[PDB]
Amino acid sequence: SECGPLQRLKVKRQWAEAYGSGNGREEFGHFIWANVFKVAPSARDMFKRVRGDNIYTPAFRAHATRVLGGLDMCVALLDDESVLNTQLAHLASQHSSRGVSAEQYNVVEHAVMMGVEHEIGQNVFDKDAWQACLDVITSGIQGN
Amino acid sequence: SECGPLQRLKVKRQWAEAYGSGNGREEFGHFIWANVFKVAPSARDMFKRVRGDNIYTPAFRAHATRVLGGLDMCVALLDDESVLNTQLAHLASQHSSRGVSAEQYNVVEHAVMMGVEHEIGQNVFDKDAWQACLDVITSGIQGN
Amino acid sequence: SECGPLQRLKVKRQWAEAYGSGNGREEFGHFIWANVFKVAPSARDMFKRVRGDNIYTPAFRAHATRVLGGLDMCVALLDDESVLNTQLAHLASQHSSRGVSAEQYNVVEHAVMMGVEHEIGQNVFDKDAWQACLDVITSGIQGN
Amino acid sequence: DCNILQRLKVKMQWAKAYGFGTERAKFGNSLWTSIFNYAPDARDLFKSVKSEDMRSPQFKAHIARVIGGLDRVISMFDNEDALNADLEHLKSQHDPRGLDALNFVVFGKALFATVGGQFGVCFDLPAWESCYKVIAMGITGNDMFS
Amino acid sequence: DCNILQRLKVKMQWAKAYGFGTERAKFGNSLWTSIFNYAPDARDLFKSVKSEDMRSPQFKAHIARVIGGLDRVISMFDNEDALNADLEHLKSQHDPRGLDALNFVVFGKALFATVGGQFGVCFDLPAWESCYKVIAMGITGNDMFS
Amino acid sequence: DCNILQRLKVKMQWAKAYGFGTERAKFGNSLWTSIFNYAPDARDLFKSVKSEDMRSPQFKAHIARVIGGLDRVISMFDNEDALNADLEHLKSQHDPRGLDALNFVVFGKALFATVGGQFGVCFDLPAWESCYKVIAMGITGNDMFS
Amino acid sequence: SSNSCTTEDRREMQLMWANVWSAQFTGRRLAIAQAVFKDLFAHVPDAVGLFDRVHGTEIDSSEFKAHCIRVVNGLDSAIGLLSDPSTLNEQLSHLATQHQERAGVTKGGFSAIAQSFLRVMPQVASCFNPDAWSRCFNRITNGMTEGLAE
Amino acid sequence: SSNSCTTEDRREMQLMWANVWSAQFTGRRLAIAQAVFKDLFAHVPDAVGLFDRVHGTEIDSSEFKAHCIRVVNGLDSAIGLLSDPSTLNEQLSHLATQHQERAGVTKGGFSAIAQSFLRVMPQVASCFNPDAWSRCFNRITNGMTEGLAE
Amino acid sequence: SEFCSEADATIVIKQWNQIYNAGIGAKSRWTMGNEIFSSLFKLKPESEVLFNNVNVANMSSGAFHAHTVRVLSGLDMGINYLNDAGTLTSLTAHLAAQHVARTGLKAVYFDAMGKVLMTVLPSLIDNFNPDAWRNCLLPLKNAIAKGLP
Amino acid sequence: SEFCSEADATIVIKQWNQIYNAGIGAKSRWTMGNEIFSSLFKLKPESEVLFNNVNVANMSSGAFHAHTVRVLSGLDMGINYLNDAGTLTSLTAHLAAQHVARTGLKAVYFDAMGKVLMTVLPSLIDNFNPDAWRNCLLPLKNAIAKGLP
Ligand SMILES: *[C@@H]1O[C@H](CO[C@@H]2O[C@@H](C)[C@@H](O)[C@@H](O)[C@@H]2O)[C@@H](O[C@@H]2O[C@H](CO)[C@@H](O[C@H]3O[C@H](CO[C@H]4O[C@H](CO)[C@@H](O)[C@H](O)[C@@H]4O)[C@@H](O)[C@H](O[C@H]4O[C@H](CO)[C@@H](O)[C@H](O)[C@@H]4O)[C@@H]3O)[C@H](O)[C@H]2NC(C)=O)[C@H](O)[C@H]1NC(C)=O
Ligand SMILES: *[C@@H]1O[C@H](CO[C@@H]2O[C@@H](C)[C@@H](O)[C@@H](O)[C@@H]2O)[C@@H](O[C@@H]2O[C@H](CO)[C@@H](O[C@H]3O[C@H](CO[C@H]4O[C@H](CO)[C@@H](O)[C@H](O)[C@@H]4O)[C@@H](O)[C@H](O[C@H]4O[C@H](CO)[C@@H](O)[C@H](O)[C@@H]4O)[C@@H]3O)[C@H](O)[C@H]2NC(C)=O)[C@H](O)[C@H]1NC(C)=O
Ligand code: HEM
Ligand code: HEM
Ligand code: HEM
Ligand code: HEM
Ligand code: HEM
Ligand code: HEM
Ligand code: HEM
Ligand code: HEM
Ligand code: HEM
Ligand code: HEM
Numbered sequence A, B, C: 001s002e003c004g005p006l007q008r009l010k011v012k013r014q015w016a017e018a019y020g021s022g023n024g025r026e027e028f029g030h031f032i033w034a035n036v037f038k039v040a041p042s043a044r045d046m047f048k049r050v051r052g053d054n055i056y057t058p059a060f061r062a063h064a065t066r067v068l069g070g071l072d073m074c075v076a077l078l079d080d081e082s083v084l085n086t087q088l089a090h091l092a093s094q095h096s097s098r099g100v101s102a103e104q105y106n107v108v109e110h111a112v113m114m115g116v117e118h119e120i121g122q123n124v125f126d127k128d129a130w131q132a133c134l135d136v137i138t139s140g141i142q143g144n
Numbered sequence D, E, F: 001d002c003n004i005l006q007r008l009k010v011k012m013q014w015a016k017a018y019g020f021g022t023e024r025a026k027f028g029n030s031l032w033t034s035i036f037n038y039a040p041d042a043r044d045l046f047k048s049v050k051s052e053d054m055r056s057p058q059f060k061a062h063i064a065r066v067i068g069g070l071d072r073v074i075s076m077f078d079n080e081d082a083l084n085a086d087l088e089h090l091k092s093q094h095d096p097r098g099l100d101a102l103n104f105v106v107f108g109k110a111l112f113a114t115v116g117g118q119f120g121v122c123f124d125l126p127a128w129e130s131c132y133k134v135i136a137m138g139i140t141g142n143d144m145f146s
Numbered sequence G, H: 001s002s003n004s005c006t007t008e009d010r011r012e013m014q015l016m017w018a019n020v021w022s023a024q025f026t027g028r029r030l031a032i033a034q035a036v037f038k039d040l041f042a043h044v045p046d047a048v049g050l051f052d053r054v055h056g057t058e059i060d061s062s063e064f065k066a067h068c069i070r071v072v073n074g075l076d077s078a079i080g081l082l083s084d085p086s087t088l089n090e091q092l093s094h095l096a097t098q099h100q101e102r103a104g105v106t107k108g109g110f111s112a113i114a115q116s117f118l119r120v121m122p123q124v125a126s127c128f129n130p131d132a133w134s135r136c137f138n139r140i141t142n143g144m145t146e147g148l149a150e
Numbered sequence I, J: 001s002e003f004c005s006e007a008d009a010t011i012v013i014k015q016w017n018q019i020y021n022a023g024i025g026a027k028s029r030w031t032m033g034n035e036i037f038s039s040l041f042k043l044k045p046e047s048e049v050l051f052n053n054v055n056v057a058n059m060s061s062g063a064f065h066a067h068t069v070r071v072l073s074g075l076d077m078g079i080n081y082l083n084d085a086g087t088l089t090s091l092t093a094h095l096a097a098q099h100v101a102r103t104g105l106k107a108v109y110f111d112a113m114g115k116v117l118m119t120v121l122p123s124l125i126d127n128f129n130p131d132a133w134r135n136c137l138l139p140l141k142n143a144i145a146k147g148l149p
């Protein structure tokens, strides 16, 4: 439903836990994008400069590292609207010229969720909270 | 092929084994429905009263518990046509007003099979037996 | 990109490793075909004589054993164009009367890759090398 | 007594205590070592199957045959018809042996002590005593197991 | 060569590698599996002792007899008299078999590979090669082991 | 002899026994301790590489160089051309050292004893003896390894 | 004894085989494949003709090679199937009918290529067990020669 | 010594870092981020100007904060990539070109923010290893300052 | 004398225990008895007449059920004693003395029973192993039916 | 003196053993020799002339193959002795005395060989680790090519 205060705390953690700290990260990433490009192989035409054809190459993993690295920045701020918006914003001016359809900001949302559930287990995963707050982060990159 | 006598025994067991006894059940369920709604997200519009939007919530898990709990009742009777029909029947009068397409009684059949195989391993899973007998249980809820 | 000399060595190994030696083979196979027929259930109409309806039966596993057994023969020769072609050829005259669409020689290619990655892990899997050399083996069965 | 509830129970406790494979041979050797210690004399009744030595394949095979039977009998506790058909079939095989029904009482205690000592404290002694009286009456016929 | 120093040595390495009890049967089965793989043909020379199957008690007994002999022979390496008396006694038992001395060469390599692979890196290949030529010459007589 | 079948074999047994990393240094130290015990004298032929002490990095490096070579040579057993090209290249490096070919025989026994004692009972002594005669003939040239 | 290919025989053959035969070593295969046929022919001369469509006379012909590897790779598939007998049967009979549509192929043909293996394996594979191997090589051919003349 | 960032140095830095820097603790990050820049500036005055588009003068400006966190979160991504060097290189050069299109950014700029970290870490992270940390902080910046003026 | 290797008897005894033990509801036993004989008969109906005493007239009679159970119970004792050649040899000799001292029993009948089991069981057992069973089951058949014309 | 940390040498020695050992078919060795030199040359063709004796004229000659093998064999001994600075230091000094007492060998050539390996190997090794190798391989290069103008 709504990305309230409580939901932002439970998300900060669940993410931090699943985003690991530098071991199962290369796997986290690979798991999300190998879901994005399966539900939307069309999308890979946007990551032409970062080898979207083969998500196994360094060049691309470096990309996904850059993406998920950003998703962090944001989640890390779901509990600070001020400095949060100031980033979601600094991110909006970066995905405008890339012509990204809001429909795509929703296929990645799901992939991320399929991966975080994958990492931390469905038994505990909280969707209404992950679906809620993730939206907030995308409806900020889309400039709102 | 046909849900003979032998096939009903091997199914009773394989199910009982995969349906567990109360531990990996919440996972059994979650695994089946997270397959149903992936091959037919359309279907979730029928489980509106049991939160079909988020298969992670209690309300819904309670639902799936109710469903798979019924599937058991039936499998538990594949070796007793009398008391079996009397249940498949008592179930038919319950899914009529719900307007369920026989096509759907076949997407759930597969999901169940994808989960039982998942639990007990493909190396032993017996499809012709699971496809056969499962049909019999659905062609009874459909009133035949 | 191109199936060079280096790429053929790294593929010979990665395959041999994932093709196992006779233990996780029945699983290797089952994993590939249970991907082929999910992305192209249409295809199962060609394996009518080897029970393509239920990839769990012996008759069919024996088939997949025959197929993957051949894929080996070939990979085993990516480092010997002479005796290699002489096999890819001996294979072309065998899949002509079977009317196989080159589109299908590409759905199996991917399935094989989804399985080899599955066996040996994405962290090491080399796509550009697997996509490259696999093509070479199919563009030989297709008679070129 | 020995209602179906206890029959389904004695079946589980048994199946458990009896085990499979080597377990069976071992369980039987303990049961018979119990019988011949409860009633030394009972032993001479089996000279034909080399009861001179309990380890001889002749006698191990006998043990295999009997408690092997006990297994099948108990396995039918939930089917009066079959159970009685086969419980009868045994009476005819045992009648001519002219066996004092008192040993069947020992086989009862031997059996109990072995299943109970193998199954652990939750052994249902009553259920077992009752449902075994059914097997004895069916085999011996003596109104001692009524 | 094969001076006493190496004789006392080959005795220790052997006694060690050969072991006792089950060890012996096992060591012998490896030595003969080595012989029949070094020279497949050599096998048909033993049809009389059921060499059709190496696990048959007929052949296991043969292995027991031969390397059992090898053991005694080597055990006398330090007594020329006895060693020669018995090394002769064998020549007469083997002469009539009309055996190509070439197999005795295989028995040499088989033996070496087994003692060496059982005793570890410190296997004295030279000492062993020499002192075995003594046993072969004593049995076969062929000037191939000179 | 030393047909390709045995060449592919000696390669596997070797690669296995030789190991990698520390294994190599260790295997070599055992092989050379075998050589200097098989032929004490052979040692003085290596004064230039500090053979006064086998643990000195000077000599450990020599061991690394030689059996390091043995490794490469054996690694080419399946390519007559290369094998011979490099087997020749060694002859020229060793010719001027004016080395008695008899030591190459010891290096043979040392090698065998170490691979066999490291690889276990299934060591193919014959295959190894044959295919090593190829390396010796290629290096020494002496018709002793024919 | 029984002569049956026991589960132990299976694990052993499977292991010894696995090391010597794998896509890892191209060349390890060729060497073995040729060796076997080359051993058959010199023991069963009028057998080269059975393999004419594959240059049985030219052991090095890029055609016979691709052949040799196919036959042995056939055995491989089988050996690996000793782990799943239900499947191995379906696979050994499909190979049976498939070997009947060929001519002069006899139960005695196999018995030869069988000695062929028993003399070849021990040269490349270390720790070979003729007895165990044989009990399972036979287990496989008895399913191939199902419908065949002596 | 060699000064190379060894696998051990990597496991250690990764660990010490992991505890102090994670999405779990919003506020743990800010505190460190600011601390670093606040240490740079007071050591390299004419450096505030390089960060004008992000209010380098207003350490608390909601803009510079979002900045500070971005830079350090950049280091995070890298440190976590010490586990997969092939990728870390592609990622450290993309960061190299990206730091060249900025002005007054020098190899000497980093060397400062490097002392910045060496004096800041030991205050928040327990069990800090200046030597190991340094060998790997440098390993990362040498891939960033690839194309840059002293 | 010698039946099957140990690891074999093992695979067989495990799978067998999966579908046959005293903990199984009389409802399944029955289904197996019938299945096994309704398959034996369709293969050798000439043998159906041998089961008069056991009321073969009706395969659904408490009389006939007991018979299939004591047949399967005897095949229960053999499989579970596979690891003890000693006793198993005697147990199978004893079973031959009976099936022989009985008239009209042809060895080919047992062969029929063999094929029946080989075909029937895999429908009940997970990943049934045809080979392990063949190596263990054949010796049993021939040992039991040793003397049957 | 000091080459690379232990855990490093470890990662390197493992990956190296994966693609280089006496169990590998002469067919791959060749492919590596060529690959490595056909890449060295395209980087420094001026160096191709140094390999006359080894018949560089033809890179497909049993003569030249042996040379790439003994080069790679020497690089085999270094990687496998990374955990023993003592001996490794001597082994690399010995290799310098030779590459130097040889004319026309420029240090920049080795640097070329370094980049070649760094680029070539990752095509053969799974999850090749550029860093571990750099920390271990660089010391080797400089140690071997210590004296080359
Ligand atoms: C094969 O042989 C069997 C022989 O039956 C078996 O062996 C015998 C020696 C007995 O020991 C049996 O226990 C054993 O099954 C033939 O089938 C049996 O035949 C009997 C008939 O005597 C079946 O019994 C049915 O009828 C009983 C009693 O019915 C009477 O009493 C009830 C009151 O309890 C009245 O309501 C009835 O009007 C009648 O007067 C009864 O308990 C059952 O019927 C009830 O339950 C059914 C539910 O299953 C309902 O559908 C009925 O409406 C009713 O309420 C019995 O059906 C006995 O069941 C069978 N056994 C089997 C396996 O079914 C069999 O015919 C022969 N094969 C052939 C055709 O050749
Ligand atoms: C680079 O140098 C090599 C030098 O070759 C290498 O070094 C030499 C010193 C030798 O030690 C060689 O073993 C080694 O490869 C040049 O290439 C080699 O050149 C030879 C020619 O002498 C190639 O050999 C081919 O020919 C032989 C013999 O052919 C004659 O005899 C056969 C009967 O066996 C007759 O059928 C022929 O008519 C002829 O009279 C033969 O064994 C091969 O040909 C057969 O096999 C082929 C299958 O691969 C078939 O396609 C043929 O139809 C025929 O049946 C050889 O092809 C030798 O192979 C090459 N080596 C290589 C790597 O191929 C090379 O030319 C030079 N580079 C250049 C061009 O500058
Ligand atoms: C979850 C929200 C997202 C975040 C936080 C995010 C973040 C980022 C970042 C930090 C960069 C690169 C910055 C740089 O180094 O220059 C980037 C690049 C990019 N993003 Fe996103 N992104 C998000 C969603 C998406 C979506 C949904 C798409 C569309 C399919 C997308 C497409 C791209 C493309 C095409 C690039 C350029 C890559 C390149 O430089 O070659 N992003 N994103
Ligand atoms: C495998 C066969 C099936 C069984 C045994 C089964 C059983 C049940 C049971 C026991 C209930 C709830 C009873 C109650 O507590 O009031 C139920 C409810 C329901 N079932 Fe099924 N069902 C089956 C298949 C299906 C299928 C294929 C659909 C369609 C997509 C479906 C849709 C529903 C719906 C919409 C409800 C009502 C849930 C609610 O009360 O909110 N069922 N089913
Ligand atoms: C990766 C490349 C492929 C290889 C190496 C391969 C190999 C083989 C082999 C060895 C056989 C059976 C030979 C025999 O025993 O008679 C076979 C049969 C067959 N293959 Fe393929 N195949 C490949 C791809 C495909 C594809 C893409 C299709 C199409 C969907 C296909 C369809 C078939 C069919 C329908 C049969 C006949 C099965 C039967 O006999 O009942 N194959 N293949
Ligand atoms: C309920 C428990 C018992 C069962 C299930 C049982 C079962 C059997 C069976 C199946 C046989 C042999 C059938 C054949 O030859 O094929 C047998 C034989 C025999 N039983 Fe029992 N029995 C039981 C109790 C007893 C008792 C208490 C005695 C008395 C001491 C006894 C004495 C014998 C004797 C003397 C034989 C003949 C052995 C021979 O010479 O072959 N049994 N029993
Ligand atoms: C030095 C090594 C050998 C020793 C100590 C040895 C010892 C013996 C002994 C003690 C016997 C049987 C004596 C008896 O019957 O009581 C024997 C029998 C025999 N040996 Fe050897 N033997 C050796 C090598 C060989 C070799 C190399 C061959 C040749 C292939 C060979 C072939 C035979 C044969 C054919 C028999 C007769 C077996 C029979 O039918 O009973 N032996 N040997
Ligand atoms: C086939 C086995 C052998 C191989 C592969 C081999 C290999 C080598 C190699 C590669 C070198 C040094 C090359 C260099 O300086 O760069 C060498 C040196 C030498 N080898 Fe061998 N060698 C073998 C057997 C022997 C034997 C049996 C002897 C005799 C006792 C021997 C005596 C020497 C000596 C004296 C040196 C010179 C050491 C020095 O002062 O640097 N080698 N050998
Ligand atoms: C048990 C071991 C054997 C195995 C595994 C085996 C396997 C095979 C295979 C896989 C093929 C080719 C199938 C295809 O083309 O798709 C084949 C072909 C053939 N096999 Fe065998 N085989 C065996 C023994 C034999 C024996 C003993 C003979 C008898 C002389 C024989 C004669 C042939 C012939 C004549 C062909 C046809 C070759 C051609 O296409 O020109 N095989 N075998
Ligand atoms: C090695 C540690 C460093 C890391 C990880 C790092 C990381 C980053 C990142 C991630 C960005 C923003 C990228 C984006 O907007 O998508 C950035 C921007 C920037 N960095 Fe760094 N940086 C480091 C050191 C430095 C140093 C030493 C200077 C020099 C004074 C510097 C100056 C800048 C500037 C001027 C910007 C642009 C800020 C803006 O957008 O207004 N960085 N850095
Ligand atoms: C290997 C499988 C078989 C086993 C384990 C087996 C076991 C037994 C046993 C335990 C008995 C009971 C003896 C008694 O009354 O004490 C029996 C009886 C009998 N068996 Fe079998 N049997 C087998 C196969 C067969 C076959 C294939 C036939 C023939 C078609 C057959 C025909 C009979 C007959 C006619 C009786 C006597 C029934 C009566 O008393 O009325 N059995 N069998
Ligand atoms: C680190 C990598 C390198 C290693 C491990 C290495 C190793 C070796 C070895 C072991 C030899 C053989 C010495 C002998 O004959 O005993 C050798 C020879 C030689 N190396 Fe290198 N080398 C390397 C790099 C280079 C480079 C980069 C060049 C120059 C372009 C080079 C040029 C030569 C030459 C010209 C010879 C002599 C060839 C002959 O005898 O005809 N090496 N090297």
Ligand SMILES: [Ca+2]
Pocket: A105, A106, A109, A135, A138
């Ligand atoms: Ca959304």
Ligand SMILES: [Ca+2]
Pocket: B105, B106, B109, B135, B138
């Ligand atoms: Ca259906």
Ligand SMILES: [Ca+2]
Pocket: C105, C106, C109, C135, C138
């Ligand atoms: Ca393709």
